[PDB]
């Protein structure tokens with residue numbers, strides 16, 4: 044059954060929803076859909092009350108106050124949330140010890156545009172594959188989906204396809220995949236990507252990006268063959284959108300039957 048995997052994005056110490064492809068910190072501010080002074084713990088507690096497991100908190104960018112904010116969410120819902128944003132071999136265990144169920148990684152395991160297998164094996168040695176989520180967010184490039192790194196500001200040379208997902212599944216508990224081109228834009232999902240994930244992921248996989256109306260959740264079911272879980276950010280009423288969080292929760296609970 045498809046699960047709603049909720050999110051909390053933290054940028055410069057604040058809960059925000061942004062258009063991720065407009066983050067330009069590797070070298071105009073990002074387009075911001077929503078920002079709040081509300082503690083990330085309040086969102087974590089909301090998700091906990093509704094029984095949503097396996098959501099993710101993202102520490103977007105290098106500001107140290109974003110780390111402090113993310114720990115507020117993990118402490119409010121221990122075991123309930125995955126955490127990502129600049130995770131590496133030096134800090135990955137510390138996030139598990141703050142209450143995260145998993146750490147989410149992309150950039151640390153890429154160098155020279157290639158998968159760095161030694162770094163991947165280092166993370167697996169430290170936290171175990173059961174507590175590692177590999178994020179394979181991607182953009183279509185030359186007819187294939189290319190995994191993008193460095194907060195979606197660099198194309199890797201690794202394609203998201205059947206053989207890559209089969210191989211990387213030996214090192215991760217789940218995959219998280221953002222449709223980078225559609226994310227944050229409230230224009231709908233990338234059904235081609237969802238279908239690829241549902242057909243070829245041997246482990247749980249969560250798609251994120253562009254879910255805007257209830258019918259998009261049904262498109263997730265159909266394109267993904269009920270094999271792909273789904274995150275909603277910008278469109279949710281609690282993040283300034285028009286799609287009611289309460290209606291997405293009820294839809295999630297209806298999948299369990």
Ligand SMILES: NC(=O)c1ncn([C@@H]2O[C@H](COP(=O)(O)O)[C@@H](O)[C@H]2O)c1N/C=N\CC(=O)[C@H](O)[C@H](O)COP(=O)(O)O
Nearest residue numbers: 052063127128129148149150178194226227252253276277
């Ligand atoms: N530029 C970015 O925005 C971004 N770049 C990397 N990540 C993730 O940072 C983590 C660590 O990667 P790394 O070891 O730091 O390289 C990985 O997961 C990267 O893929 C991002 N996700 C940020 N928020 C996610 C979010 O708000 C909702 O999930 C989603 O966008 C809502 O979509 P919606 O509004 O409904 O369209």
Ligand SMILES: [Cl-]
Nearest residue numbers: 153154155156
């Ligand atoms: Cl790289």
Ligand SMILES: [Cl-]
Nearest residue numbers: 278284285286
């Ligand atoms: Cl909306």
Ligand code: NA
Nearest residue numbers: 150151153154
């Ligand atoms: Na890297």
Ligand code: NA
Nearest residue numbers: 060061227276
């Ligand atoms: Na977003």
